[PDB]
Amino acid sequence: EKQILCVGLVVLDIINVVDKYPEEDTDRRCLSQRWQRGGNASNSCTVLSLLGARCAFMGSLAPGHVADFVLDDLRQHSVDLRYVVLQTEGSIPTSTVIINEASGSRTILHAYRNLPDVSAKDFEKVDLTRFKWIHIEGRNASEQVKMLQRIEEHNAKQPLPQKVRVSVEIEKPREELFQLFSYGEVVFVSKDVAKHLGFQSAVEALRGLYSRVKKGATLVCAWAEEGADALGPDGQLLHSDAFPPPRVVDTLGAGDTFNASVIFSLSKGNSMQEALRFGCQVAGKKCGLQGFDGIV
Amino acid sequence: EKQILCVGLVVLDIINVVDKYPEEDTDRRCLSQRWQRGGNASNSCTVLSLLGARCAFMGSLAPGHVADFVLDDLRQHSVDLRYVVLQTEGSIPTSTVIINEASGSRTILHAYRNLPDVSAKDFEKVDLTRFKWIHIEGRNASEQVKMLQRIEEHNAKQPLPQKVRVSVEIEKPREELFQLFSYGEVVFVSKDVAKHLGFQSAVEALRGLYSRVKKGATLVCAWAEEGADALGPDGQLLHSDAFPPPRVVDTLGAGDTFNASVIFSLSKGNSMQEALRFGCQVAGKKCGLQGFDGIV
């Protein structure tokens, strides 16, 4: 069975669930605390696996307690790990998350430093025939452009049923990541990126950014509680409302849940309109529960 | 060589160093992040070892990644672990700490749940002849009173040079811990406890609480930037000013550093006046550096 590969980041999330945001200079009891594997591409693998797809994760690790936890958790979710890249310096980041139950707020404190990223040389070793879909979390764009060019060259020699589908996520507002707009059949652009580029709504972002994507691609822009929108080569602006839970309890990884669910739905042959709705449905369900496993 | 035993808690501290307190609902970069072994008795062992005393830690653990980290860190500090209690249920807590560099503030989010505590039955197995000093972090007072009675019964059969010295810490404002005032030759009472009992300064706390201690004992009350005070059987109110660093950068474990340093100084034969000064000196130095190792 062909797999879906996600290339990007893994971290350890240290999660603190509170009913009031902590007052500075105090020591207070949480409602609950837990460790949770995180990172955009890593979370997307979790969701793909829960939805039933065979998937693989490619990202950097360094030996230690965090790696042991992360690898055990990936195995618990049947995620294929043959392409992880073991580094000899640095640490896997431990991000601190505060989730406020009373309001649904999500506050993240992240590492000043990240491990060396998966390079184009690392990616050269991936057997592309094992994958029906490859999703790249935008990080080190110059190296990732080389990976995407390698996939394109592979696909140029494959017949239609053997081409590898490609998606990219442009989530951080860094200009170097905008090189990625012109790769992939599906480009996920975050609300933060859209606003950094001057666009104040999903529809405005689609109309303003569509000219950057590869000919024939679809641009997707989720806009949190306002749902998600897409624009592809047929020229039709698509929109799904969000599917909010009765109470927002945990939004950590909600965007990754949306992305993975859109990928899953498209991989099963559904239209972009159906995939957008499905992504909003699964992400909204996730926002009403802790972690990911309860999306079932 | 006789050891100093500390009975109490170990946790994993997940530390986030920031120059601005995090704004709720945002995702922001720290100046630095690290894992650090914590818990009052555990931190006191770290400081005793750094000062050169042979010491031992007795506390509960449960198997897993946190235990592996904690035990490795205790070994790195030459802390004797033969009396740790391995539990079959629960988790070692992971506490989240936010340290604000701009102000010196310390914010702690701690676990709703803690492991089963070291019991009197567990303590019955400790060979008291191995120890010249036993320090108990007040937690489960009814069990700990039984431990303290066992030490007293042991000491009643020992000559003067073979008696085990005893100290207790009463740090949390829980009425059941106040049973511990009447045990030990040295009782450390926190500012928080003093204020819960209605006393608004160290001197007022000493005069108001001294009647609770065992005949002949010394009550010690540190009051943060106002230094620390003590009152013993000679009737003399003692005080040391604090020794603040040029910039307060990290106060996590400062109270444990004070307690351990007082214990160390007394164990070396110094007076309470000298030990109070020494404790303020080491704790103030610690407040100007990250972690403990730099106290040298």
Side-chain angles (χ1 to χ4, degrees), chain A residues 70-111:
Chain A
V70 158
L71 292 162
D72 282 351
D73 193 81
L74 286 159
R75 280 191 290 269
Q76 279 189 65
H77 287 94
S78 314
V79 178
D80 195 312
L81 300 179
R82 74 190 68 196
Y83 294 123
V84 297
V85 181
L86 258 301
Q87 306 294 353
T88 56
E89 300 265 35
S91 275
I92 300 172
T94 292
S95 294
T96 284
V97 185
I98 300 167
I99 300 294
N100 183 347
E101 274 325 285
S103 67
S105 73
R106 174 190 69 207
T107 307
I108 304 173
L109 287 63
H110 59 80

Side-chain angles (χ1 to χ4, degrees), chain A residues 265-278:
Chain A
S265 180
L266 294 173
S267 79
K268 298 298 279 199
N270 300 112
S271 70
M272 186 63 237
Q273 176 100 290
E274 297 165 311
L276 206 54
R277 176 168 178 279
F278 182 76

Side-chain angles (χ1 to χ4, degrees), chain B residues 4-11 37-45 56-61 70 74 81 83-85 87 92-93 114-119 122-123 126 134-140 144 147 167-169 172 180 256:
Chain B
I4 301 175
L5 175 65
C6 294
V7 181
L9 180 57
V10 62
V11 303
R37 177 172 49 85
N40 286 20
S42 161
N43 287 338
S44 288
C45 284
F57 171 73
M58 178 169 205
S60 290
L61 305 171
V70 158
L74 286 159
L81 300 179
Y83 294 123
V84 297
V85 181
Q87 306 294 353
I92 300 172
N114 292 104
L115 282 173
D117 291 303
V118 176
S119 67
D122 296 327
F123 188 79
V126 177
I134 296 175
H135 174 72
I136 299 183
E137 174 194 346
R139 163 78 184 162
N140 50 332
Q144 294 174 323
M147 303 176 197
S167 57
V168 301
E169 182 190 35
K172 307 286 189 287
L180 301 171
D256 305 318

Side-chain angles (χ1 to χ4, degrees), chain A residues 116-133:
Chain A
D117 291 303
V118 176
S119 67
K121 176 68 221 87
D122 296 327
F123 188 79
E124 265 187 298
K125 309 174 183 174
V126 177
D127 183 351
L128 299 175
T129 70
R130 298 186 213 256
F131 300 103
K132 61 183 180 180
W133 193 295

